[PDB]
Amino acid sequence: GLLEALNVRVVGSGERILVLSHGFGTDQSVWQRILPYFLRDFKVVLYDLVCAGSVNPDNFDFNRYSSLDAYVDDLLAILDELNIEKCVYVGHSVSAMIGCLASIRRPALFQKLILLGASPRYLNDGDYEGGFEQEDIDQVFSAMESNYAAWVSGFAPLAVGADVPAAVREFSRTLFNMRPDIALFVARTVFESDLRGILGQVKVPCHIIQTKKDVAVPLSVADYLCRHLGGKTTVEILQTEGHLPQLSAPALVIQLLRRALSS
């Protein structure tokens, strides 16, 4: 029942497998603007993280999903049930770290990882600029508790970054679709994560796609991933502002993604 519960979709006529995994606050509809342009060369697998509002919250086990490993378990169980033994994986935001952890568990499963808006750690640490202090994320948690709508209206336009009203509308919609207690629980999981230690164990090639101005990911984080991932790594700067460029600048994302995929 995992395929139905996480709204797994297999679409396209291509011969290679492309997996699209979204970040916190949205669902697989975040890929709607770029999805048509990869169905020729790839058979695309999409799914919703267990925390998405489009997933019945009866599936969210707070004990189980206290760790990102449970999200990795879901991803691997989906690919196993689909009999997928090799794929290229695009992970947006937290799904990028989910892909890295999954590649460590299954080194032969992932041919290439494409990290979109990826960060191993959002909290600052000395010269490591993650972009946030504990006071920052504590203010986020406090805002979600006192008034969830007030937090959404502050997070959605700043996450989109650029003045693209259609992208703000879409990201606001999926954020308001999320249950407030789940949003608070999962934000704590992502905001307080630190995967810097396991980056060296990732051996598959990684393509890092970073926007020129991301409120959630400083530029130095993209170069940190480049230097510490244990395999072949390349960094490309999307010439746009925002943390969800597949919504706010799809044409540029399609161009860059086609290059990284040889399509």
Ligand SMILES: [Cl-]
């Ligand atoms: Cl995220």
